[PDB]
Amino acid sequence: GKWREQLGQKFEEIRWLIEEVRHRLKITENSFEQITFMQALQLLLEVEQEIRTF
C-alpha cells in the first residue's frame, strides 16, 4: 500500500544522499568517521527492512 511505499522511497533517498557524501571523502578504514558511516548505513538498511516487514 501507498504509505509504506512512499516511506521506503524516502529511505532509499536518505541512504543515497549518505552514500554520496561518503563517496566524496577520503578517509581510512578504521577512522571514527568510516566506522560512523557504516554504522549509519547499516541502521538505515535495517530500518528500511523493518518497514517492509511490518
Swiss-Prot record:
It is found in: Virion; Host nucleus. A motif (Nuclear export signal) lies at residues 23-32. Interacts with protein M1. May interact with host nucleoporin RAB/HRB and exportin XPO1/CRM1. Average number present in a viral particle is estimated to be 130-200 molecules. Belongs to the influenza viruses NEP family. Mediates the nuclear export of encapsidated genomic RNAs (ribonucleoproteins, RNPs). Acts as an adapter between viral RNPs complexes and the nuclear export machinery of the cell. Possesses no intrinsic RNA-binding activity, but includes a C-terminal M1-binding domain. This domain is believed to allow recognition of RNPs bound to the protein M1. This is Nuclear export protein. It comes from Influenza A virus (strain A/Puerto Rico/8/1934 H1N1). The lineage of its organism: Viruses, Riboviria, Orthornavirae, Negarnaviricota, Polyploviricotina. The gene is NS.
